Amino acid sequence: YQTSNFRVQPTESIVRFPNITNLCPFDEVFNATRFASVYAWNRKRISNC
Amino acid sequence: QCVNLITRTQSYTNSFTRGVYYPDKVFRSSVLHSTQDLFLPFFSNVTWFHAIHDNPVLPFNDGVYFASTEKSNIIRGWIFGTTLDSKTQSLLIVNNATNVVIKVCEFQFCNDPFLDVYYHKNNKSWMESEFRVYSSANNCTFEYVSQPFLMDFKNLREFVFKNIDGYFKIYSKHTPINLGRDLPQGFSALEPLVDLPIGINITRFQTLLALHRSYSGWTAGAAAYYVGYLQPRTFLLKYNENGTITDAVDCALDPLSETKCTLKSFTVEKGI
Amino acid sequence: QILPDPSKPSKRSPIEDLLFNKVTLADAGFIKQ
Amino acid sequence: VNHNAQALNTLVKQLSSKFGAISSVLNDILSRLDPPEAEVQIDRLITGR
Amino acid sequence: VNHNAQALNTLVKQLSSKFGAISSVLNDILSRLDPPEAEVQIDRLITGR
Amino acid sequence: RVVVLSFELLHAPATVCGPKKSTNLVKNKCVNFNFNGLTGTGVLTESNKKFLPFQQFGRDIADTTDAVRDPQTLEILDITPCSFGGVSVITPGTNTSNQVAVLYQGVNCTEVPVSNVFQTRAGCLIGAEYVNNSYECDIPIGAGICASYQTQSQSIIAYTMSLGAENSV
Amino acid sequence: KFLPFQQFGRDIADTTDAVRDPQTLEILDITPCSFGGVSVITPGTNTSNQ
Ligand SMILES: *[C@@H]1O[C@H](CO)[C@@H](O)[C@H](O)[C@H]1NC(C)=O
Ligand SMILES: *[C@@H]1O[C@H](CO)[C@@H](O)[C@H](O)[C@H]1NC(C)=O
Ligand SMILES: *[C@@H]1O[C@H](CO)[C@@H](O)[C@H](O)[C@H]1NC(C)=O
Ligand SMILES: *[C@@H]1O[C@H](CO)[C@@H](O)[C@H](O)[C@H]1NC(C)=O
Ligand SMILES: *[C@@H]1O[C@H](CO)[C@@H](O)[C@H](O)[C@H]1NC(C)=O
Ligand SMILES: *[C@@H]1O[C@H](CO)[C@@H](O)[C@H](O)[C@H]1NC(C)=O
Numbered sequence: 001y002q003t004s005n006f007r008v009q010p011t012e013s014i015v016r017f018p019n020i021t022n023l024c025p026f027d028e029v030f031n032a033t034r035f036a037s038v039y040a041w042n043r044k045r046i047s048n049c
Numbered sequence: 050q051c052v053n054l055i056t057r058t059q060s061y062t063n064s065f066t067r068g069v070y071y072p073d074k075v076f077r078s079s080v081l082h083s084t085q086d087l088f089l090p091f092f093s094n095v096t097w098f099h100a101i102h103d104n105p106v107l108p109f110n111d112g113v114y115f116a117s118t119e120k121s122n123i124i125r126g127w128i129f130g131t132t133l134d135s136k137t138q139s140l141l142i143v144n145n146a147t148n149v150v151i152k153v154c155e156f157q158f159c160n161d162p163f164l165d166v167y168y169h170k171n172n173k174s175w176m177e178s179e180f181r182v183y184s185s186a187n188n189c190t191f192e193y194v195s196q197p198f199l200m201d202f203k204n205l206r207e208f209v210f211k212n213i214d215g216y217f218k219i220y221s222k223h224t225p226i227n228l229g230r231d232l233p234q235g236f237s238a239l240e241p242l243v244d245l246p247i248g249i250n251i252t253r254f255q256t257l258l259a260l261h262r263s264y265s266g267w268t269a270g271a272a273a274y275y276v277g278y279l280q281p282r283t284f285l286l287k288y289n290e291n292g293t294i295t296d297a298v299d300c301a302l303d304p305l306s307e308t309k310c311t312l313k314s315f316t317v318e319k320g321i
Numbered sequence: 322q323i324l325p326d327p328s329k330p331s332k333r334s335p336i337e338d339l340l341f342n343k344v345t346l347a348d349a350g351f352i353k354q
Numbered sequence: 355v356n357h358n359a360q361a362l363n364t365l366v367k368q369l370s371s372k373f374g375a376i377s378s379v380l381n382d383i384l385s386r387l388d389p390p391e392a393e394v395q396i397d398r399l400i401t402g403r
Numbered sequence: 404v405n406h407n408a409q410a411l412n413t414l415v416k417q418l419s420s421k422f423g424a425i426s427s428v429l430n431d432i433l434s435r436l437d438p439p440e441a442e443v444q445i446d447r448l449i450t451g452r
Numbered sequence: 453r454v455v456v457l458s459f460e461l462l463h464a465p466a467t468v469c470g471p472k473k474s475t476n477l478v479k480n481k482c483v484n485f486n487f488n489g490l491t492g493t494g495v496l497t498e499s500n501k502k503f504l505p506f507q508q509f510g511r512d513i514a515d516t517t518d519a520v521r522d523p524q525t526l527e528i529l530d531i532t533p534c535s536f537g538g539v540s541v542i543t544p545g546t547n548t549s550n551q552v553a554v555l556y557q558g559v560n561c562t563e564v565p566v567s568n569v570f571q572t573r574a575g576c577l578i579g580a581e582y583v584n585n586s587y588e589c590d591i592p593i594g595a596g597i598c599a600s601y602q603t604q605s606q607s608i609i610a611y612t613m614s615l616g617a618e619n620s621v
Numbered sequence: 622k623f624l625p626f627q628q629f630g631r632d633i634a635d636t637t638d639a640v641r642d643p644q645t646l647e648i649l650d651i652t653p654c655s656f657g658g659v660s661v662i663t664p665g666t667n668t669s670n671q
Contacts, residue, residue, distance in 0.1 A: 001541050006556065006566045008535040010493045013484040017472040018523035026455075035453055047190060048246075048467040076507040076519065190464075215465045240506055248464030292504050305670060308661045319665045347359050351595060352573040354558055366514050374446045381491075415634045 024049040050181035052265055053161040054258065058099035064277050065232050066091050068114040069284070069297050070209050070220040070239035077288040081313055083300075084286060087211060087279040089114045091299040095232075095277035102269045103161065105255045112211035112279040113254065116232065122146060122199055123272045125164060126257040128183075129210075129217075131250045133158045135185065138249040140217065143257065144197045145177060153191035153247055156183030162255060167262040182257070191247055198242070203229045209239055211279065215248035232275070238294035285310050373402030422451030474524060482534040487520045492531065496520075499530040535563050537575065542591055542608065544601040553579035553599060553608045570610060572597050577610055586614035623648055 029044060036042035068089035095114070107113075109129070117124050122144065130139035135155040143150045143164070162182045168174045199206060202225040209220040220239035256274065260267045285298040300310035308317055325332040333341065372378045375395040376386070383395045421427045424444045426435070432444045477496070484493045490509065501510060501519050510519030510528070519530050542553040554577075561569050561576040570577045574594020583602075590600035593610065602609040623630070623641055630639030630648075638651050664671070 001543070002538055002557075003541050004539040006537055006539050008482050008563060008566075010482050010484040010534065012478065013486070014475050014478055015486045016474040016477060016523055017488060020471050020473075029455060045190070046468055048193075071506070074506055074508045076501070076503045076510040078501075078510075080513060215463075240504070246465035246467055248462075291502060292507060304661045305663065305666075308663060315666075317663055317666045319663065319668070321660050321662045344355075347355055348362075351558065363514065370515075374443075374450070412634060419635065 022049065051159040051161055052267060053103050054100060054105065054163065055103040056099070056101050057104065058101070060097040060099070062095050062097045062231060062275065064089060064091065064093045064095045064114075065234055066236060066297065067116070067207065067232050068209055068239070068277060068279070069236070069286070069294060071241060071294060072286075074241070076292045078292055079290050080288050081315070082286050082288065083283060083310065083313065085281065085283045087112050088282045088284055088299075089209075089277050089279050090282055091302050093277060095275045097231075097273070097275050100256075100258065100272045100274075102258075102260060102267060105161070107254055107276065109210075109212070109252050109254055110278045111281075112209065114277040114279060115208040115210065115256075115274065116276075117206050117272070117274040118203055118229070118231075119272055119274075120204065123259050123270055124199065124206075124256060124274060125259060127210075128156075128158060128162055128255045128257070129251045129253075131252040133253065138188075138190065138247075139183075140247060140249065140251065141183065142198075143179075144199045147197060149195050149197045151191070151193040151195075151245065152186070152189060153249060154186055154189030157185045158183045163258040163260055165260050165262060165267065167266070168264075177259075191245070193245060195243070202227065205233070207237075207239055209279070210254075212251045215246060217243075217245040217247045217251070219243040219245075236294075236296055283310065285313065285315075287315060369403065371402070373398055375399055375402075417452070420451070422448060424448050424451075477522065479529070485520075485531075488523050490517065490520060492517060494531045494533050496529045496531060499528045501528045501530070503528055535559050542580065542593070542599050544608070548601060549606065551579075551606075551608060553577060553610075555593060557594075572610070580608045580610040582610045585611050587611060589613040 024046060072084045072086045095116075115127075125145075126141065126143035128139060128141055131137060133139055133156070135157050137155060138153050139156050139158065141152045141156060159181045164177055164179060164182055166175065166177050169176060198208075198219075198221065200223060205224045205226055207222045207224070209218075211218050218241065220241045222237055222239040224233075224237045226233045258270075258272060260270065262268065283300040285300060286294050287296040289295045296315065298306050298309045298315065300307055305317070309315060322336055323334050325334055326338070329338070370378050375383070375398040377383055377395070378399070380396065380399065383392050383399070386392070387395065419427050424432065424447050426432050426444070427448070429445060429448065432441045432448070435441075436444065479496045479498065482493065482495050485491070485496060488508070499519060503510070503519075503521055508521050509517055512518045517531060519528050521528055537559040538557040540555045540557060542555060543549075544551070555572075555575050556564060556578070557575040559575055561571045564576050564578065568579055568581045570580065570582045572594055574597065577593065577597075577599075580599050587598070587600060589598040591598055593599055596612050597610055598613045599608060599610050601607075623639075628641050629637050632638050640649050640651060641647070642649060
């Protein structure tokens with residue numbers, strides 16, 4: 001008599017993503033040799049990072 | 050600066066079975082898969098331009114198939130965009146024989162965009178300037194550099210450009226051929242070398258040319274290239290054991306091809 | 322041609338061997354799946 | 355053999371049909387929507403299957 | 404002959420039934436309603452048919 | 453010194469945002485995996501499939517994912533589903549005995565835990581003792597195997613069935 | 622031959638197959654336009670592509 005079904009339950013989860021390599025950091029904007037005055041306040045675009 | 054290429058020498062040719070590419074990044078082995086995508090239909094009409102030193106205006110029309118057979122790098126890059134009057138973003142792709150440069154911000158684009166080489170002694174020489182390709186640049190949201198597209202017989206270079214959902218996709222292939230009967234009869238699928246999250250609207254394009262100076266010298270040259278257009282069609286692609294598109298069927302070419310797509314096989318037995 | 326062949330591992334006749342080759346079985350995966 | 359194989363393939367490929375619901379995969383239905391409004395979509399998937 | 408004719412006539416008659424939709428003429432559902440409701444009504448007709 | 457970060461989430465594709473992290477890759481074990489947003493469950497195994505360098509997934513004739521490429525180690529991993537099956541209970545009548553055997557249909561005996569464990573082609577048979585005899589079939593189990601209630605204390609035995617008494621005319 | 626008060630014309634399956642013209646008072650049969658399956662007769666591709 002076919003009484004039930006069984007499953008093997010997944011023990012644990014894994015998550016994998018590619019190497020964390022290409023970062024444009026904020027060291028270039030915080031470790032600046034000299035900042036910019038307010039009337040000429042420096043501005044940088046940050047994209048694809 | 051802006052000395053024009055007043056030349057088209059337009060012609061028309063058969064596409065045969067050329068512009069097939071990989072529609073996704075999925076491996077498949079020994080399978081026949083039906084894909085409904087933007088393809089270059091079999092045996093369509095591809096325009097064959099000869100450029101010698103006007104109207105280099107071209108549309109985009111859901112995507113472009115581009116091909117060339119020039120031995121050297123007379124063909125360099127491409128200009129893409131809806132309207133090219135420095136109002137909205139304009140893609141620009143350029144090769145400098147060591148990398149490839151892609152920019153997006155609006156450019157002036159003097160009405161015959163072309164590069165020049167003009168041997169120097171300034172640093173050493175050979176900087177291939179840009180001053181009147183587009184004059185000005187501002188508000189540049191994207192920029193990209195890579196190993197150059199136009200690498201390296203006859204050496205057919207095929208490119209497929211399309212623009213979907215803010216992504217500019219570029220597929221290509223470099224097939225060395227011998228008979229040189231323009232587009233050869235056979236099969237060769239184009240792998241997806243680049244995807245760019247550019248998010249701009251592309252409607253017109255143009256190419257770019259080299260034009261060395263004599264010693265404005267601008268020594269004359271000849272560049273031959275084909276352009277075809279892509280539209281939505283269903284194809285039956287045949288992936289071999291390794292995952293390579295080895296063959297394809299255009300389901301709307303003729304009644305036999307529609308039968309092949311219905312049976313989902315490349316061989317059909319006697320019957321109705 | 323119809324009697325079992327003893328040389329072969331499975332004791333099938335030549336005609337039965339031909340029959341089993343000629344039909345390509347699909348859903349016969351039982352022990353290992 | 356072929357008739358049964360194609361019946362099974364029809365059954366399997368009918369799993370990925372939304373039957374009018376907002377999507378076919380159950381996990382997307384559950385995460386995107388709250389339990390009451392995702393209940394309708396899940397019930398439609400259930401009756402279709 | 405009669406059984407075949409009866410089956411075909413029942414199939415044809417099933418076209419002029421609402422199946423819970425507010426009309427049985429797809430043109431009426433299209434014209435008199437809006438997508439977020441005409442679409443659902445048409446889908447219910449499709450399920451019935 | 454003051455720095456102000458201003459965030460644009462315009463309708464163009466997004467390209468700047470935080471690390472996604474990665475946890476380690478458990479092979480030979482039914483896990484709940486997620487490779488670059490491709491989620492699923494199953495047993496990950498090393499494979500000899502050769503993807504093309506731009507190809508990240510593998511698909512089956514029925515459009516289900518058979519393989520992945522690990523986004524860090526450029527390695528192809530086959531994915532098999534976890535080991536579901538049916539469970540049948542073999543019994544002599546309760547008029548006879550309260551003793552039973554269990555068949556786990558179409559699964560390997562190794563992964564059974566959800567006493568006389570035998571591996572048939574119908575599945576894993578538990579609680580029946582296999583014998584090197586042959587009787588007329590009593591309870592049909594599967595690929596040539598039957599079960600019966602035997603004496604030599606009574607127990608449940610599994611055997612390969614006998615097609616009949618041999619006879620040479 | 623419609624009766625002078627009739628406008629439509631219906632079949633056994635309750636589909637219109639005649640109309641009286643409101644201007645010339647003429648009766649026009651209505652026939653569905655045309656349709657049907659399309660079959661491809663082939664010898665084997667092992668034999669011809671015709
Ligand atoms: C450079 O930036 C780092 C950020 O981690 C900071 O700790 C360090 O003090 C900075 N050094 C200089 C010289 O700006
Ligand atoms: C292009 O190449 C030339 C020489 O090959 C080089 O001087 C120049 O810097 C390159 N341009 C870019 C943007 O990399
Ligand atoms: C790719 O397919 C060819 C036949 O078309 C075969 O000879 C070759 O071995 C395959 N590649 C590999 C890595 O086996
Ligand atoms: C059972 O699993 C072991 C290892 O897990 C394997 O070696 C064996 O072949 C398997 N048997 C069957 C019938 O699948
Ligand atoms: C990822 O980083 C690891 C460092 O352990 C390195 O061995 C591996 O080659 C890298 N892979 C990619 C695809 O960057
Ligand atoms: C309708 O008008 C036409 C003129 O366009 C006329 O010839 C015809 O007799 C009229 N019929 C009726 C029923 O009014």
